[PDB]
Amino acid sequence: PQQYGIQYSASYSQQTGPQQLQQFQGYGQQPTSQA
Amino acid sequence: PQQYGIQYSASYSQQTGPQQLQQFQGYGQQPTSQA
Amino acid sequence: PQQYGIQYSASYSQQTGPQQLQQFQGYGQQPTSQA
Amino acid sequence: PQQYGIQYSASYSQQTGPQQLQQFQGYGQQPTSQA
Amino acid sequence: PQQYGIQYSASYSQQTGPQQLQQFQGYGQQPTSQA
Amino acid sequence: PQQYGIQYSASYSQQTGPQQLQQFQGYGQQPTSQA
Amino acid sequence: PQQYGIQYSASYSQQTGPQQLQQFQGYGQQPTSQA
Amino acid sequence: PQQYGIQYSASYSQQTGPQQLQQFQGYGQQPTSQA
Amino acid sequence: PQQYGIQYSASYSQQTGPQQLQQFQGYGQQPTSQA
Amino acid sequence: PQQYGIQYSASYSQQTGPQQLQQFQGYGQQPTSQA
Amino acid sequence: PQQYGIQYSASYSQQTGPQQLQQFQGYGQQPTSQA
Amino acid sequence: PQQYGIQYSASYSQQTGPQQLQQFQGYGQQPTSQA
Amino acid sequence: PQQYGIQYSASYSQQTGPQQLQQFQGYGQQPTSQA
Amino acid sequence: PQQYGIQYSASYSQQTGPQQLQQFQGYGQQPTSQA
Amino acid sequence: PQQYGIQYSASYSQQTGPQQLQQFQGYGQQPTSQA
Amino acid sequence: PQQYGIQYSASYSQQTGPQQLQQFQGYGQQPTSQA
Amino acid sequence: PQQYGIQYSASYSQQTGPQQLQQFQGYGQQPTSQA
Amino acid sequence: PQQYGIQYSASYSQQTGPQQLQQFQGYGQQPTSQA
Amino acid sequence: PQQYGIQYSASYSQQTGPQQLQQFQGYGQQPTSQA
Amino acid sequence: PQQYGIQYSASYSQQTGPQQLQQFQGYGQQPTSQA
């Protein structure tokens, strides 16, 4: 099992804003609750 | 099992706004609740 | 099993707004509840 | 089993608004409930 | 089994509004309920 | 089994409004209920 | 089994309104209920 | 079995209103009920 | 078995109103009920 | 078995109103009931 | 001067196809030309 | 001068296809030209 | 001068397809040209 | 001069597809050109 | 001059697809050109 | 001059897809060009 | 001159996808060009 | 001149995806160019 | 001249993803170029 | 001239992801270039 978020190869990246990368491998849970 | 979010190859990327990448491999749950 | 979100090859990308990429491989659940 | 969201090859992309890409491979459920 | 969302080849894309791409491969369910 | 949403080849695309592409391959269900 | 939503070849596309493309390959159900 | 929604070849398309393309290949059901 | 919705070849299309294309290949059912 | 909805060849089309194209190939049923 | 497109009062509406409603109040012109 | 597109009062609406509502109040022009 | 697109009062709405509402009040022009 | 796009009052809305609302008040022009 | 896009009053809204609301008040122009 | 995009009053909103709201008050221009 | 994007009053909001709000008051221009 | 992006009053907000708010008051220009 | 990005009053906010707020008051320019 | 980014009054804020607030008052320029 291989998991790759972002890959660049001879490329140009310009990122001016906010960026979020969340990875779960296996048994991942992301619960959000607002009571 | 291979999972790839974004791939660039000899490319140009300009990203000025917000960006979110969430990966789940295996057994992933993303529950959202508002009671 | 291969899963690819976005691929660029000798391309030009300009992204000025918000962007969301969510990947589930295997057994993925995205429940949303509003009681 | 191969799954590809978006592919660019020697192309030009300009995306000014919001963009959502959600992928499920295998056994994916996206339930939305409003009680 | 191959699944392709959008493909560009030597093309020009300008997308100014909101865009949604949801892929299900295998056994996918998208239920929406409003009680 | 191959499934292709949209294909461009040496073409020009200008999309100013909202766009939705939903793909189901295999055993896909999209139920909508309003009780 | 091949399924193609929209194909462009050396063409010009201008789309100013809302657009929906839903594909089912295999065993697809789109039930809508209003009780 | 091949299924093609819309094809353009050296053509010009201008679409200003809403557009819906729904494809079913195999065993597709689109029931609508209003009780 | 081949099924083609609309084909353009060196043509000009201007579509200002709403447009619906629904394809069923194989065993397709479109029941509408109002009790 | 080939099924063609509409074909254009070096033609000019201007469509200002609503348009519906429904295709059934194989074993298609379109029942409408009002009890 | 009052102009009403469609009115429902304790009624049940099921609309499965495309629908277009265009209203002009005052001095409205809808010319269509194909030269 | 009052202009009303669609009105619902204690009613049930189920709309499964594409829908377009364009309103002009005052001095509205909707010309379409294909040269 | 009052302009109302759609009004709901104690009603139930289920809209599964694409929907477009464009309003012009005053001096509105919507020209479409394809040369 | 008052302009209202959509109004809900004690109502239930379920919208599963793409939706576009464009308002112009005063002196609004929406020209679309494809040369 | 008052302009209201969408209003909810004691209502329930469930929106699962893409949504676009563009407002112009005063002297607004939305030209789209594809040369 | 008052301009209101979306208003909620004692309401429930569930929005699962992409959403775009663009407001122009005064003298606003949104030109899109693809040469 | 008052401009309001979104207003909530004793309401419940659940937003799971991407969201874009752009406001221009006065003399605002949003040109997009792809040469 | 008052400009308000989003307002909450005794409300509940749950935002799980990316969000962008851009305000221009006075003389604002947002040009995007891709040569 | 007053400019307000987001306001909360006796409210509950839960923000799990990326968020961008850009304000320009006076004479603001946000040009993006990709040559 | 007053400029306010975010205001909280007797409120609860939970922010789990990345957040960006950029303010320009007077004569502000945010150019982004990728040659």
Curated annotation (Swiss-Prot), chains A, B, C, D, E, F, G, H, I, J, K, L, M, N, O, P, Q, R, S, T:
Compositionally biased intervals (Low complexity): 1-34
Subcellular location(s) of the protein: Endoplasmic reticulum
Tissue: Ubiquitous.
Domain of life the protein comes from: Eukaryota
Disorder this protein is connected to according to its UniProt record: A chromosomal aberration involving TFG is found in papillary thyroid carcinomas (PTCs). Translocation t(1;3)(q21;q11) with NTRK1. The TFG sequence is fused to the 3'-end of NTRK1 generating the TRKT3 (TRK-T3) fusion transcript.
Function noted in UniProt: Plays a role in the normal dynamic function of the endoplasmic reticulum (ER) and its associated microtubules. Required for secretory cargo traffic from the endoplasmic reticulum to the Golgi apparatus.
Assembly and oligomerization: Self-associates to form an oligomeric complex. Interacts with PDCD6; promoting localization and polymerization of TFG at endoplasmic reticulum exit site. Interacts with SEC16B.
Descriptive protein name: Protein TFG
Whole sequence portion shown: 265 to 299 of 400
